[PDB]
Design a protein around this ligand. Structure first.
Ligand SMILES: O=P(O)(O)O[C@@H]1[C@@H](O)[C@H](O)[C@@H](CO)O[C@@H]1O
Length: 478
């Protein structure tokens, strides 16, 4: 009654440490190894899978005490995979200055600080009670605990190994336990029948990298894989013609983009970045490669932001006249610019790049594709243009404009974006004020600066498609 599942995936994460595994490919694995304190109810308030009401998980209950503090009462007798009982000490360590948000924690969780709330040190009240605290007020704590930043780690084991080594031999509380990790190849996990929640329904899960999507489709058809990920609308007709198979597709709260290494002289200033942005004909790409199923957002602005979503914001601009003028102004040499892509790790990455290369040729810029294999990513000094994505992981516009593009983020710190001082001051501002017209307007000003500066260029939200045998009723791919 419990099958061993074989899952053909687009990629494999670089680690299984849950924060450092945040990517398009990590969470589907780490969400089976680890649990959170609370979980989102994806079908609350009539939502078709993107609901936000919070429900108990490792925490049986919780109470917001004040604008800075939330007490969690933990489930008792929850076992980590190595037999150690989870306690409030583990939860406190998970959100500690040492592990997550303090100064030295950046050396090993590079993005921990940028993706953290303004935490203060947790307080352990007793074995099963912990208080999560923030130095300044925020309403986001509880929902943050249901996010991909909330996965609970075992303090003693993790601290002994350290972040990096723990990521190669992870121990969690989740329904599946670690068996093996081969970089750029596979992860195997097995049923944890000591799980505190519903008994696992699969005996084992193997996530196998299959880089080419047509090979993933063919492996589903042959029975080599039970489930495959990261397909496109074009694959659906063929798969659905097999009575034993099916596809599922939906718009995801994630956007595809391209971005720049702004430490490189050719992109240190906005003119050539903005020229490349203004020449992207998004409706043509969507009609050609996505069967008109991918969604083009009106800026860095998504409905899940709730009170900081602007439903009346203007479209992102397409203006080849202005693009040509900026190519001339920038002083651009005609020298080819590389665009690195890890094959089709992002669905339609290579065919979308080929369409954009032609769009860029029409404005006088020569862009060359550099298609590489997993593990073959270039050193930052050899990177110029590259593709990326951002998952919109909070019900607030703080993520990902501030997380990724704010003064504490990687776009400014690692990739060298010298953002206007006004942008960094508005990032600081929205983070210290509550939902209101000043906050809503500040996000619209950040969005405008983002478009004028072009540190990245938003393409669209992909229509994500997965496929599986109909007789495989549980699919651990999100
Ligand atoms: O495109 P990727 O697979 O690398 O994954 C990105 C992360 O890098 C990013 O940290 C996060 C939040 O913005 O969204 C995605 O998961």
């Amino acid at each position: 009654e419990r099958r061993a599942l074989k899952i053909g995936v687009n990629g494999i994460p670089v680690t299984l440490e849950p924060i450092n595994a945040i990517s398009n490919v990590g969470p589907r694995i780490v969400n089976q190894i680890f649990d959170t304190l609370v979980v989102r109810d994806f079908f609350s308030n009539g939502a078709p899978g993107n609901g936000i009401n919070l429900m108990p998980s490792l925490a049986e209950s919780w109470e917001r005490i004040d604008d800075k503090s939330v007490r969690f009462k933990l489930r008792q007798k929850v076992m980590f995979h190595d037999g150690v009982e989870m306690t409030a000490d583990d939860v406190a360590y998970t959100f500690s200055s040492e592990r997550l948000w303090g100064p030295d924690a950046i050396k090993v969780i590079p993005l921990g600080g940028s993706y953290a709330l303004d935490f203060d040190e947790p307080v352990v009240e007793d074995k099963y009670t912990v208080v999560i605290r923030t130095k300044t007020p925020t309403p986001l704590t509880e929902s943050y605990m249901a996010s991909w930043m909330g996965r609970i780690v075992p303090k003693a084991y993790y601290k002994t190994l350290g972040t990096a080594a723990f990521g190669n031999k992870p121990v969690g509380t989740g329904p599946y336990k670690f068996v093996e990790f081969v970089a750029n190849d596979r992860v195997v996990i097995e049923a944890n029948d000591a799980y505190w929640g519903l008994k696992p329904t699969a005996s084992k899960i193997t996530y196998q990298l299959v880089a080419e999507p047509a090979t993933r489709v063919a492996g589903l058809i042959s029975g080599e894989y039970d489930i495959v990920t990261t397909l496109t609308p074009d694959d659906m007709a063929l798969i659905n013609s097999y009575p034993d198979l099916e596809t599922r597709g939906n718009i995801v709260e994630n956007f595809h983009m391209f971005t720049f290494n702004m430490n490189q002289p050719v992109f240190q200033s906005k003119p050539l970045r903005r020229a490349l942005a203004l020449a992207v004909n998004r409706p043509l790409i969507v009609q050609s490669l996505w069967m008109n199923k991918a969604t083009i957002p009106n800026g860095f602005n998504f409905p899940n932001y709730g009170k900081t979503f602007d439903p009346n914001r203007r479209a992102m601009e397409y203006n080849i006249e202005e693009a040509k003028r900026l190519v001339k102004e920038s002083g651009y040499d005609g020298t080819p610019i590389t665009y690195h892509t890890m094959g089709n790790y992002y669905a339609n990455a290579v065919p979308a790049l080929m369409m954009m290369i032609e769009m860029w040729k029409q404005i006088g810029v020569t862009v060359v594709p550099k298609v590489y294999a997993p593990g073959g990513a270039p050193k930052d000094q050899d990177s110029y243009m590259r593709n990326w994505s951002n998952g919109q992981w909070m019900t607030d516009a703080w993520a990902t404009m501030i997380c990724e593009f704010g003064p504490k983020g990687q776009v400014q710190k690692r990739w060298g974006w010298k953002a206007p001082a006004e942008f960094n001051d508005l990032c600081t501002k929205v983070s210290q004020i509550p939902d209101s017209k000043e906050r809503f307007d500040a996000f619209n000003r950040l969005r405008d600066i983002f478009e004028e500066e072009a540190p990245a260029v938003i393409l669209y939200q992909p229509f994500d498609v997965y496929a599986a045998r109909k007789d495989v009723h549980w699919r651990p791919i999100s």
